[PDB]
Amino acid sequence: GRTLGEQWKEKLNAMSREEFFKYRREAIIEVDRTEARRARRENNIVGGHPVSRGSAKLRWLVEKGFVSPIGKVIDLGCGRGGWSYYAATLKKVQEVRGYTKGGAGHEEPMLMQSYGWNLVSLKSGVDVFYKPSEPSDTLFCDIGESSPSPEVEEQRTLRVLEMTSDWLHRGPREFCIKVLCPYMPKVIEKMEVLQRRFGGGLVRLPLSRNSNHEMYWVSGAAGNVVHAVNMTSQVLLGRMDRTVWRGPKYEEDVNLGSGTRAVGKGSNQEKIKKRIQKLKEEFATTWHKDPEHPYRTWTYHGSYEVKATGSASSLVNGVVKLMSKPWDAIANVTTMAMTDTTPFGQQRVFKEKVDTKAPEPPAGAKEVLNETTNWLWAYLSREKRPRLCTKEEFIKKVNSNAALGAVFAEQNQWSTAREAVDDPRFWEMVDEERENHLRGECHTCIYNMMGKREKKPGEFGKAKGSRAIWFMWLGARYLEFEALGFLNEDHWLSRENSGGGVEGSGVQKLGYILRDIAGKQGGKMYADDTAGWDTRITRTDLENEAKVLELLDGEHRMLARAIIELTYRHKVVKVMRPAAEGKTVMDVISREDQRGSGQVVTYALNTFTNIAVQLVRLMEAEGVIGPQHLEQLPRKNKIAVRTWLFENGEERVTRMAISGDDCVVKPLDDRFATALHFLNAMSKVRKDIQEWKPSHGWHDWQQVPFCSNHFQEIVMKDGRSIVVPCRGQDELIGRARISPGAGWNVKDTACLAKAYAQMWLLLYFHRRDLRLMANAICSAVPVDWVPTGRTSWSIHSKGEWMTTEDMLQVWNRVWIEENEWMMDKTPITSWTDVPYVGKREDIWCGSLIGTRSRATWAENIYAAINQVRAVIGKENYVDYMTSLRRYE
Ligand SMILES: Nc1ncnc2c1ncn2[C@@H]1O[C@H](CSCC[C@H](N)C(=O)O)[C@@H](O)[C@H]1O
Ligand SMILES: [Zn+2]
Ligand SMILES: [Zn+2]
């Protein structure tokens, strides 16, 4: 009770609730929050309304010189993001990163479109007390949880000051740090030591309410700490006991405006000029060059107004949910959501993942890739001969529902792909562009880039933004397919031809292939994921892929050359973006590197390059090359590379399983784990691991991740063994619980549930919970109804369950009949003779067996089934529950 603050606190703690809320707002300045709250209600994130009162507080501080935010701003305990968004409106600020705890009983970051929103990056679920410090130019911290006990607040405050000191030690000359309880002795001492070392002073905002004693240690203040605090205490004490409460003085809230901001700094225009010109002309009406466009590594050409496209909804699948009551309690399943594919949705991912420049590899690294890719092209073409693909081939393999991909009104004459390929007028458009290509010109081959609708873990209690996919229109895709599609159609990256690849194989083959690799002598199995593979394909990588041309001649070569040079290298792309005031715009941008996700040969070229990368890593691992060769390759090891490849290559690729950017490799020893110098120089940086930390390997091949699964060997009842795919049961159920959009009627969602159920039966029958849930779903869905919808995006999903045939029959087809690693072709006649994984593995991968929630669920499954049957209604049903032992 010694300090005046302690007297204030004690008097505060003794107030009645009614008086507390009068005193709280007495004589303070308060921003009118009315309009902001209506904005929050009406989902208006483009009107300039700040997410909290925190924007006004920071505004007051900069308008008074107390802090002048600049450069890279770090914001500790950002909450909704109030400070972060205000900083981003400021000219001198170029980057904002917020961190915050989030979760139950804490504020999550809110996603806004305030001016400069593209400079901001908020992160939730972070405990900053144990987050390693990072360099920054401006540092913010608004952490400090109140308490009726000054002693508690004192210790909390100290913990923050102690924490911020680690961050101040790394440069920030600008700062603004909350000091929750400034009047307590140990805090006073800490402030004095900190002020000496880093400067600044303690300030009390007139925007703060009288119910706290918070002060801000800001870099552009100064003064005696003690004096400052006592002056605050006195004001506070003075405002107690009034005869008449006069209330606060009202101010207007800050208006943060809207729209993206330009990034600083940021030219083979010949080969793209026609395309741009044709677009500028077709959309001249509102065409313009936005000075505030957010592109940093893409070159920008212009923008025009368009109607926004995409969705931000996730809806629940009612039938799956009814059959999965125990998972209602699993956060991992219920916080999953469809990704946001609105333009704001994809753009907020675009600025992090796609607008990056992967550096070109250094000269020595190039020379080694050169020899490797020479070797690899030679090896792939040892037996196979390139060829044109035909119109008829295209028409037969085009999905009747492939994207049209119109980029010009002229390309938008058909309502489905099937109609286009059936219309002579389409092929006339193709021919016309074809003849242009033969003359080394390209007029209309242009990508649309948009958000991919995906089922993913949530973010800030809501949906994640979307991954960008891009592809050219049906006509351009035909031309690609004609020139380069032989790679696909004649299976140039099949295992038989590539050694390392796995083209064509369903998931059901993948485990067996991993096992075969395990049988070779060598070290641990590795499986490093490259972060954002397509965005890391360099000019060098493209130049090496371009060596297909040397396998081609005449007309065939010329067509292929146009695809490769005019279409894969000189890419022109159309992407939507949020403009100001709720309107959206189509940007036309370009760049020479990176790989477009929806090129006809993306998988092939990815597989090809990934094999070459692994070959290079193995050479560094086996000693042929090292860091001393990155800047220049000596003639002698340049030759060793050649001979290494020549003598070893064919064996070495058999130690790989390469599916696009997905890789598994069993090197000779474990020097591989530190063979990272070339890997990093080639820009193929590893995902989720410090740049130079060695790679983790596995001893058990059954724990190796490949194409989103790992694989388990299980011995069946009749003594035969199978290798099956296995993965987190939480997400499997999480995804089945999500419907692809709004407005889906009972029958359609029932048919999607039925596809998820049947995919489970065919691939994850060995997971106890799923087999029960699958039979339960199929028992609640009318037998006649036909499975519809996507259950996977993986190229290795072959969809055998998308059928009305009995699932046991198809089980035998893929697991016995067509399974080349199963000698004994003895058919399985009943489900009970189909194995499970060990309960140890089942539980490790999310199973709920042995739990009482599950028990209740299992025992009462029929009630669940009947609930769904009622909703669907009188129809023809069948009970499959009896195919499980416990229901006989
Ligand atoms: N240890 C911790 N690590 C990260 N965040 C924390 C934390 N302790 C508290 N927080 C969070 O930090 C936030 C401070 S309130 C932030 C207000 C913000 N300046 C604005 O204007 O919007 C709270 O939401 C709180 O949940
Ligand atoms: Zn073209
Ligand atoms: Zn598993």
Side-chain angles (χ1 to χ4, degrees):
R2 38 257 309 268
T3 74
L4 287 171
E6 288 168 279
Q7 297 174 21
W8 159 86
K9 186 59 141 188
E10 172 177 355
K11 297 195 50 177
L12 186 61
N13 281 346
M15 273 168 173
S16 72
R17 187 209 58 84
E18 178 164 23
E19 183 173 33
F20 180 93
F21 286 103
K22 293 190 179 188
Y23 165 67
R24 201 168 90 113
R25 292 171 80 246
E26 249 271 325
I28 68 170
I29 296 177
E30 197 155 76
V31 294
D32 194 346
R33 284 296 278 166
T34 317
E35 274 288 292
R37 284 163 188 166
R38 175 171 291 292
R40 181 165 38 238
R41 265 175 269 132
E42 303 179 348
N43 307 303
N44 177 12
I45 64 163
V46 297
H49 304 91
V51 305
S52 60
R53 299 194 176 271
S55 284
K57 302 172 87 178
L58 177 51
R59 185 241 241 131
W60 185 94
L61 288 171
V62 337
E63 286 183 2
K64 296 213 165 298
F66 285 127
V67 64
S68 304
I70 197 245
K72 181 189 174 191
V73 173
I74 289 179
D75 182 6
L76 273 12
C78 65
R80 290 180 192 158
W83 292 50
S84 291
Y85 288 116
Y86 179 79
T89 68
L90 304 170
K91 186 71 180 181
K92 289 193 297 188
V93 161
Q94 64 202 349
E95 180 185 348
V96 195
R97 326 285 300 194
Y99 305 93
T100 210
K101 180 57 184 164
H106 290 303
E107 285 295 341
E108 290 288 349
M110 288 178 46
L111 297 159
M112 294 302 280
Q113 268 183 53
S114 51
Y115 183 69
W117 63 262
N118 62 292
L119 299 189
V120 173
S121 239
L122 304 189
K123 226 249 156 110
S124 171
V126 179
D127 194 332
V128 307
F129 284 127
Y130 302 107
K131 173 175 183 65
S133 58
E134 300 174 2
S136 82
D137 310 337
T138 305
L139 177 71
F140 291 160
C141 188
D142 211 16
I143 291 171
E145 181 198 359
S146 80
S147 178
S149 158
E151 178 180 0
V152 164
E153 291 184 334
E154 181 196 40
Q155 89 86 32
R156 282 167 187 178
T157 307
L158 270 178
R159 195 190 180 186
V160 173
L161 294 176
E162 184 46 46
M163 187 261 300
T164 60
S165 58
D166 297 21
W167 293 80
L168 289 177
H169 171 59
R170 300 174 143 276
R173 296 319 164 197
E174 302 284 343
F175 56 82
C176 181
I177 303 180
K178 187 186 179 178
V179 183
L180 169 78
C181 189
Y183 56 87
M184 287 293 286
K186 308 197 213 179
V187 169
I188 294 290
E189 234 288 285
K190 191 69 166 170
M191 267 320 299
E192 282 166 349
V193 174
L194 260 28
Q195 185 178 34
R196 214 176 302 134
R197 176 173 171 199
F198 296 115
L202 249 38
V203 185
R204 171 79 176 181
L205 285 270
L207 254 15
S208 289
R209 30 282 301 259
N210 302 326
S211 55
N212 68 77
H213 205 284
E214 92 210 343
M215 295 183 82
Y216 291 88
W217 177 25
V218 314
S219 59
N224 173 281
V225 173
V226 161
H227 180 90
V229 174
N230 276 327
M231 295 296 302
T232 296
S233 299
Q234 199 31 69
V235 174
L236 260 25
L237 291 155
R239 285 168 173 183
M240 293 171 163
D241 311 313
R242 308 251 140 139
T243 44
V244 170
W245 310 98
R246 302 203 64 189
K249 286 144 187 186
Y250 298 96
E251 264 185 13
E252 213 174 358
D253 201 347
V254 30
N255 181 335
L256 301 166
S258 71
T260 57
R261 273 186 65 191
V263 155
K265 345 142 291 86
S267 183
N268 197 315
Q269 301 299 291
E270 272 189 339
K271 306 195 179 182
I272 59 159
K273 206 180 182 188
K274 299 272 198 169
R275 276 118 121 197
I276 304 300
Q277 192 37 51
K278 182 169 167 51
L279 285 162
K280 186 181 168 166
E281 187 153 340
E282 168 139 355
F283 307 94
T285 334
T286 72
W287 185 279
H288 64 275
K289 256 199 163 72
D290 189 338
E292 297 278 43
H293 75 87
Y295 306 102
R296 169 190 275 95
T297 54
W298 292 72
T299 129
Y300 173 78
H301 302 275
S303 330
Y304 60 95
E305 313 181 2
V306 274
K307 194 180 174 50
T309 217
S311 174
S313 71
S314 351
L315 286 313
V316 168
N317 184 304
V319 16
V320 180
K321 180 170 177 181
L322 247 15
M323 308 305 304
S324 60
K325 194 216 172 68
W327 290 262
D328 278 350
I330 313 303
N332 273 353
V333 344
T334 60
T335 66
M336 296 200 77
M338 270 297 176
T339 58
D340 184 325
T341 53
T342 66
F344 179 57
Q346 103 78 32
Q347 203 74 26
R348 72 185 164 95
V349 169
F350 181 95
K351 63 191 192 80
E352 299 309 323
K353 296 272 179 270
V354 186
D355 201 353
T356 68
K357 179 60 179 84
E360 290 302 306
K366 291 181 182 178
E367 297 182 38
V368 193
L369 274 173
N370 201 321
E371 307 294 330
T372 313
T373 60
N374 286 356
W375 181 86
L376 190 55
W377 273 128
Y379 176 71
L380 290 171
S381 59
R382 98 196 87 104
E383 222 149 357
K384 288 178 184 296
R385 241 224 193 87
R387 77 178 169 88
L388 294 182
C389 287
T390 70
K391 158 159 163 188
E392 317 83 75
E393 283 171 23
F394 189 89
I395 297 176
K396 180 170 133 217
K397 84 131 29 173
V398 90
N399 176 266
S400 304
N401 293 312
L404 240 87
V407 133
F408 292 110
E410 80 205 41
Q411 301 175 340
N412 198 35
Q413 302 180 40
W414 305 272
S415 53
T416 65
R418 171 104 282 124
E419 286 174 29
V421 297
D422 284 352
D423 180 354
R425 173 161 291 272
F426 170 84
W427 295 105
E428 295 167 352
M429 286 196 54
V430 169
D431 283 350
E432 179 175 343
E433 176 75 352
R434 217 227 205 208
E435 202 70 349
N436 272 345
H437 283 186
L438 287 168
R439 287 175 203 223
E441 268 178 82
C442 175
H443 282 50
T444 64
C445 306
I446 291 163
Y447 297 85
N448 288 122
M449 181 178 280
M450 76 274 314
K452 182 181 194 179
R453 284 282 273 184
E454 273 178 323
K455 289 152 174 198
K456 285 291 162 218
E459 197 184 31
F460 317 140
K462 291 192 188 313
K464 258 170 187 168
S466 45
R467 176 183 303 280
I469 53 179
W470 35 321
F471 50 94
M472 294 174 300
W473 93 288
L474 233 218
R477 279 187 283 122
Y478 171 77
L479 292 178
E480 284 174 81
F481 172 76
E482 177 192 48
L484 303 165
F486 67 88
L487 290 168
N488 298 330
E489 307 301 301
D490 297 332
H491 313 291
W492 277 51
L493 287 145
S494 69
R495 197 153 188 75
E496 175 152 341
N497 198 77
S498 64
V502 287
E503 191 270 344
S505 326
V507 194
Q508 339 95 41
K509 311 273 175 186
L510 295 195
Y512 292 113
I513 303 179
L514 277 199
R515 185 222 254 164
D516 285 338
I517 298 177
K520 302 205 179 317
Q521 266 284 49
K524 300 175 163 206
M525 253 156 285
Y526 298 77
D528 297 333
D529 286 34
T530 309
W533 177 269
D534 289 349
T535 71
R536 308 256 97 197
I537 291 297
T538 59
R539 273 136 44 196
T540 305
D541 292 323
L542 295 173
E543 290 177 8
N544 288 299
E545 283 152 19
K547 295 168 185 182
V548 250
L549 303 190
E550 298 160 18
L551 277 53
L552 305 177
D553 52 86
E555 197 185 47
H556 193 347
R557 183 170 54 186
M558 189 73 174
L559 292 161
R561 176 179 307 280
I563 298 306
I564 285 168
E565 302 182 3
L566 304 192
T567 267
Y568 284 1
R569 173 184 166 189
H570 289 89
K571 304 172 296 305
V572 182
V573 177
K574 304 173 76 208
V575 236
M576 300 193 172
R577 166 169 64 90
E581 305 201 24
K583 285 158 283 182
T584 131
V585 107
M586 244 299 169
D587 292 331
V588 178
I589 64 187
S590 52
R591 79 188 287 132
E592 296 199 21
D593 54 332
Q594 304 200 17
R595 161 103 73 238
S597 100
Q599 296 173 0
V600 168
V601 285
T602 291
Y603 183 77
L605 298 193
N606 274 354
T607 302
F608 173 93
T609 293
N610 205 14
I611 286 175
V613 168
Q614 301 316 314
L615 246 14
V616 171
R617 185 167 173 184
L618 290 164
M619 281 184 304
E620 176 181 356
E622 300 185 12
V624 183
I625 46 184
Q628 348 100 32
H629 300 142
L630 252 51
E631 290 306 321
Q632 213 63 71
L633 200 65
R635 213 259 168 186
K636 61 160 207 298
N637 17 28
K638 200 273 262 193
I639 265 61
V641 169
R642 275 229 258 279
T643 343
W644 187 95
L645 288 171
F646 168 75
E647 283 184 283
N648 297 320
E650 303 172 58
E651 188 275 335
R652 224 103 310 180
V653 303
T654 68
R655 292 169 164 264
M656 308 178 184
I658 307 301
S659 168
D661 60 331
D662 270 277
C663 66
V664 177
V665 176
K666 183 165 189 169
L668 292 185
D669 57 70
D670 299 278
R671 285 172 287 163
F672 190 85
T674 356
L676 302 181
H677 284 93
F678 282 89
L679 188 73
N680 278 331
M682 290 180 312
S683 304
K684 302 298 172 300
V685 291
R686 294 160 307 154
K687 138 139 294 191
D688 291 333
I689 185 176
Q690 210 279 341
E691 189 174 24
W692 298 108
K693 175 185 174 177
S695 309
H696 176 241
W698 285 266
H699 269 294
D700 183 20
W701 65 266
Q702 278 174 109
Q703 296 195 61
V704 178
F706 180 54
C707 297
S708 288
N709 293 269
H710 60 261
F711 305 84
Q712 293 288 285
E713 194 166 350
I714 304 170
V715 180
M716 307 173 58
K717 189 172 181 169
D718 62 42
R720 288 181 292 184
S721 73
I722 57 183
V723 183
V724 300
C726 202
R727 65 185 295 172
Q729 193 184 259
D730 281 338
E731 286 198 316
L732 289 179
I733 295 160
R735 292 155 130 201
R737 277 181 161 229
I738 302 179
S739 290
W744 286 58
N745 62 23
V746 168
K747 171 164 190 172
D748 286 333
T749 122
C751 298
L752 185 49
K754 189 175 172 183
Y756 273 107
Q758 291 184 347
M759 176 197 68
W760 290 350
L761 286 184
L762 196 267
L763 295 179
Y764 305 113
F765 44 84
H766 52 91
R767 309 297 317 272
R768 277 158 189 87
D769 298 337
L770 296 185
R771 187 130 132 212
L772 204 165
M773 197 186 293
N775 289 275
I777 283 167
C778 299
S779 292
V781 167
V783 218
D784 326 81
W785 290 6
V786 45
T788 59
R790 165 171 313 268
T791 62
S792 173
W793 281 104
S794 175
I795 195 176
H796 303 285
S797 294
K798 300 308 194 183
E800 299 89 352
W801 52 90
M802 293 305 279
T803 167
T804 204
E805 184 189 2
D806 176 86
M807 277 304 158
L808 228 197
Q809 290 173 17
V810 0
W811 197 93
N812 293 282
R813 189 141 57 242
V814 343
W815 289 114
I816 308 300
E817 181 181 336
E818 301 174 351
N819 178 4
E820 53 277 28
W821 289 270
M822 179 106 305
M823 308 310 176
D824 199 329
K825 299 295 178 179
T826 310
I828 305 291
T829 124
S830 53
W831 275 111
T832 57
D833 291 326
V834 182
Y836 290 104
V837 282
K839 307 186 156 190
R840 184 181 178 225
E841 182 72 1
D842 217 345
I843 292 179
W844 181 248
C845 291
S847 177
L848 247 50
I849 54 184
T851 284
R852 54 235 306 198
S853 226
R854 203 212 115 116
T856 309
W857 174 66
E859 297 164 24
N860 295 332
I861 196 64
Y862 280 89
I865 301 182
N866 293 336
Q867 288 188 352
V868 170
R869 284 181 174 174
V871 174
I872 292 184
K874 176 173 150 83
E875 238 287 353
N876 289 295
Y877 295 110
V878 158
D879 183 16
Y880 297 92
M881 299 317 291
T882 57
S883 56
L884 292 347
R885 226 191 216 267
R886 64 128 71 219
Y887 299 110
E888 290 164 341

